[PDB]
């Protein structure tokens, strides 16, 4: 158990791998007689650690301007995309322009138009499709990789529940929700479930997901570029 004070609060999100330096101490709340069913333990005080340090596991502008000002930026970027994979120059260029992406535009009427690109790939097994998806996931600043049916311990789309104890609306971040402005790679496009398949239509079209349950109606934002692979 860890105790953080003052400015150390909210520096760590649950799930992070951390190295913490602190003081090993015990709780002090006076004295009290042992209670409960078990009274074998005598003179035992609960212990904790008081946290004191946490570690979580302008010049570049000119460099980027020089890189983009060349006449051969397109070829350099295309070659930079997966040099290990033989061939597929057009596919690499398409992947690069997908990574850069377009621009979204609003209108006075309030309607919005999509600014992200979606791609589909079909082919026989052994054409190195998963490798491209992994390279895109690693290269993109924000990237998610799924198997179509969700993942080991996370679904493809968000879900909403209500905690009976606290009566609060808890939302589980799905694969699409966890990415905002990034790239979502989807292998095995054929094996999608019905509800996820229905939701992905709205996710691709309006980049939003609408969920309505007892006493709640919400519209979450999912501005995700989609890169998909499927088999014959």
């Amino acid at each position: 158990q860890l105790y953080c004070d003052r400015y150390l609060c909210d520096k760590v999100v649950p799930g992070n791998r951390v190295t913490i330096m602190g003081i090993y101490s015990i709780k002090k709340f006076g004295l009290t007689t042992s209670r409960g069913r078990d009274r074998v333990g005598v003179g035992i005080r609960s212990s904790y650690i008081r946290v004191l340090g946490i570690q979580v596991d302008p010049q570049e502008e000119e460099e980027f301007r020089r890189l983009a000002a060349l006449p051969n930026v397109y070829e350099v970027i295309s070659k930079s995309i997966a040099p290990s994979i033989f061939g597929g120059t057009d596919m690499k260029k398409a992947i690069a322009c997908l990574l850069f992406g377009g621009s979204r535009k609003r209108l006075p009427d309030g309607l919005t138009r999509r600014g992200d690109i979606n791609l589909l790939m079909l082919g026989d097994p052994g054409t190195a499709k998963s490798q491209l998806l992994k390279f895109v996931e690693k290269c993109s600043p924000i990237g998610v990789y799924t198997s179509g049916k969700g993942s080991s311990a996370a679904g493809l789309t968000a879900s909403v529940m209500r905690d009976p104890s606290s009566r609060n609306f808890i939302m589980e971040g799905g694969a699409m929700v966890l990415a905002d402005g990034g790239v979502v790679c989807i292998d095995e496009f054929d094996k999608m479930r019905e509800d996820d398949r229905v939701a992905i239509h709205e996710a691709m079209e309006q980049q939003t997901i609408s969920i309505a349950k007892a006493g709640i109606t919400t519209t979450l934002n999912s501005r995700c570029s989609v890169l998909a692979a499927a088999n014959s």
Binding site: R37, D38, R39, V40
Partner: protein, 366 residues
């Protein structure tokens, strides 16, 4: 804790539960699952009000505990002269293989194969352990499938009446917690106590399961685990424990369509998973033949049984003698002779050769 027996139940009543307390040496006896007689007193323990110039409950204190109906050298010493004489008389008879068949199943006509299989299951084998740490099964499991009303459920009831430690279940009447075990708190200490299930009560005995197809998939998985590992593992309520369940299972089942299909294999006739199917040692199939002589023979026996309620039985040995002989015989651990190895090898070779393609297809592979 003790429970009222079924014989004392009045109309539409549930058996009553009572609490007994044992002191000193009498603490040792009175294990769970037994049927015992207790001797003692009835004494009130507190659980109207008093004043200066009241809730109570009934608790039984017992002095002695005895069996209701009462290491080869120790067994020999315990037995009296006449009991040992009867055991010796039984041991030196070949007809013991036949007479016991008439002894346990007098009313049932025919089906001698099922009787012999039941006897072999009752006697059981010898368990062994290997040097690598693995264990070899020594128990025998028997499964019966047949057409309706082909004396299928009578064998289970006979095993109930004969065996002293037997538990019988049917279909969905037994829950998952009913089998395996449960863990509850101790009322006067920090310890925990375990309530035994059907399998644990039938430890080193016979467990009878009727309507085996109606059991849920989870229950069948639990039964398969018990058959395979012969161990029940409980990790609940802060308690982790492992218990031994060395039981032998006798099961009854029915065809999917209600009648046995002669033109289909055994696997296509029963809705049982392959793992639990492979664990069974013997499968018996009963088909009702439309034969006049068989119907006449069955009718004779039924009408004779109904006409003479108790005079139509000519048992050779009493059930008590059979129980004593079984208890004495189960201690033995016979070995395998050298020539038996070659004989078994040749017989297994012949059995495998029987599976050739020159003969019609069999309903079960070897």
């Amino acid at each position: 804790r003790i429970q009222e027996t079924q014989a004392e139940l009045p109309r539409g009543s549930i058996p009553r539960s009572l609490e007994v307390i044992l002191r000193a040496e009498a603490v040792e006896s009175a294990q769970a699952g037994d049927k015992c007689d207790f001797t003692g007193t009835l004494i009130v323990v507190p659980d109207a009000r008093a004043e200066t110039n009241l809730s109570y409950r009934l608790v039984f204190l017992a002095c002695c505990v005895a069996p209701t109906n009462p290491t080869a050298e120790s067994i020999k010493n315990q037995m009296t002269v006449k009991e040992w004489e009867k055991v010796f008389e039984m041991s030196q008879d070949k007809n013991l293989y036949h007479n016991l068949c008439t002894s346990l199943f007098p009313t049932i006509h025919g089906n001698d194969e099922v009787k012999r299989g039941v006897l072999l299951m009752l006697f059981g084998g010898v368990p062994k352990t290997t040097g690598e740490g693995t264990s070899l099964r020594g128990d025998i499991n028997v499964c019966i499938v047949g057409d309706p009303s082909t004396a299928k459920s009578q064998f289970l009831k006979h095993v109930e009446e004969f065996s002293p430690r037997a538990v019988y279940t049917s279909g969905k009447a037994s829950s998952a917690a009913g089998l395996t075990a449960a863990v509850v708190r101790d009322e006067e200490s920090h310890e925990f106590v375990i309530e035994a299930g059907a399998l644990m009560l039938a430890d080193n005995g016979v467990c009878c399961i009727d309507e085996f197809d109606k059991m849920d998939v989870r229950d069948q998985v639990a039964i398969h685990e018990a058959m395979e590992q012969q161990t029940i593992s409980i990790t609940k309520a802060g308690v982790k424990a492992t218990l031994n369940a060395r039981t032998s299972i006798l099961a009854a089942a029915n065809p999917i369509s209600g009648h046995y299909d002669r033109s289909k294999s055994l696997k296509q006739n029963i809705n049982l998973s392959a793992p639990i199917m492979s664990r069974f040692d013997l499968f018996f199939i009963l088909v009702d033949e439309c034969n006049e002589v068989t119907d006449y023979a069955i009718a004779r026996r039924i009408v004779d049984l109904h006409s003479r309620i108790e005079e139509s039985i000519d048992r050779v040995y009493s059930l008590d003698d059979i129980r004593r002989y079984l208890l004495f015989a189960r201690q033995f651990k016979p070995k395998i002779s050298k020539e038996s190895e070659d004989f078994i090898v040749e017989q297994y070779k012949h059995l495998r050769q029987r599976d050739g393609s020159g003969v019609t297809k069999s309903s079960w592979r070897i």
